[PDB]
Ligand binder design. Structure first.
Ligand SMILES: O=C(O)CNC(=O)C(=O)O
Ligand SMILES: [Mg+2]
Ligand code: NI
Ligand SMILES: [Zn+2]
Length: 331
């Protein structure tokens, strides 16, 4: 069995290997990359996402989200308070202000220490989940707006034609902006490209051990767990590495820098934080190996998780027994 300790693997494809996206994902899996839940892909030196980022300041962040924490430093939830619209240039200036800017630090480890010590005492503003793309249309390799769609994959594997679309999302971050512990919708893959700015630190639980994280989460968030049998779908709970280690939960960590891709694999729980002003692009995708994960994915039916249009068909076809309850949660 390849990668039996479930380490995060880092790949350096050549420009030739960068042509065929599906083939390279399958390659990475042949080497055991999926066992970690997360892999890093460093693009060949010849590749670029676009020519420059000099002209992005007029993108609008219609609903910036202030991420307000409750709990203790290592075990907390966050809720998202909506803020007034602002442009990317206005948000960058805000991220760089004395109130929000990254503190002086020695290295990524010192910054990570400071994040876990101090995150809860601040409320950073995240421009998350913005439909759009920063890939140039002429970028033909690993262009996250030109991937094969999940609907087409389901149709190719299973023969059933379904409605829905699959487009990327932009994320504008600042120091301490946080992504809570989650797997993707329908336990899909994700791919995330850090276009510019400061790094993003990731934490991940191997898919084979995801239920250990869920059991810890039920213990640590007992009211939330009574409310919903899949409350991590709400994407609000944080647990620090120190707490994970104290509870024996297997995990790994890595820091993504600008110019690098990360892939999350089906049922790979992940969480993390931004180091400072940055911009990432991410999209969900599927492969043949995903189908079995999609069929088994948990679902929130309490009403909190509220998701895209396109998830309807995935539930309806892959999980017909759960469909009626899940759809009630949506309505
Ligand atoms: O970058 C973020 O805030 C969150 N991204 C992801 O969870 C992902 O790419 O799967
Ligand atoms: Mg612009
Ligand atoms: Ni994710
Ligand atoms: Zn729920």
């Amino acid at each position: 069995a390849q990668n039996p300790n479930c380490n995060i693997m880092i790949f350096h494809p050549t420009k030739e290997e960068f042509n065929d996206f599906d083939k390279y994902i399958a390659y990475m899996e042949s080497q055991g990359a999926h066992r970690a839940g997360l892999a890093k892909i460093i693009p060949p030196k010849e590749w670029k996402a676009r020519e420059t980022y000099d002209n992005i300041s007029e993108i609008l962040i219609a609903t910036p989200l202030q991420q307000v924490a409750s709990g203790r430093a290592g075990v907390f939830t966050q809720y998202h308070k909506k803020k007034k619209a602002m442009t990317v240039g206005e948000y960058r200036h805000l991220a760089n202000s004395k109130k929000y800017q990254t503190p002086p630090h020695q290295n990524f480890e010192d910054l990570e220490r400071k994040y876990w010590k101090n995150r809860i005492y601040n409320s950073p503003i995240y421009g998350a989940d913005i439909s759009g793309s920063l890939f140039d249309e002429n970028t033909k390799q690993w262009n996250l707006g030109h991937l094969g769609t999940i609907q087409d994959l389901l149709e190719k594997e299973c023969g059933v034609v379904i409605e829905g679309v699959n487009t990327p999302y932009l994320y504008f971050g600042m120091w301490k902006t946080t992504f809570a512990w989650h797997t993707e919708d329908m336990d899909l893959y994700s791919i995330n490209y850090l276009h510019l700015g400061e790094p993003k630190t990731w934490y991940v639980v191997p898919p084979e051990h995801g239920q250990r994280l869920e059991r810890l989460a039920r213990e640590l968030f007992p009211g939330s767990s009574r409310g919903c049998g899949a409350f991590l779908r709400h994407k609000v709970a944080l647990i620090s590495p120190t707490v994970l280690k104290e509870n024996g939960i297997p995990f790994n960590r890595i820091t993504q820098e600008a110019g690098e891709f990360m892939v999350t694999f089906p049922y790979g729980y992940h969480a993390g934080f931004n180091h400072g002003f940055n911009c990432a692009e991410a999209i969900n995708f599927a492969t043949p190996r995903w189908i079995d994960y999609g069929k088994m994915a948990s679902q929130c039916s309490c009403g909190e998780a509220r998701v895209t249009f396109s998830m309807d068909a995935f539930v309806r076809i892959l999980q017909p027994e759960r469909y009626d309850l899940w759809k009630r949660g949506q309505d």
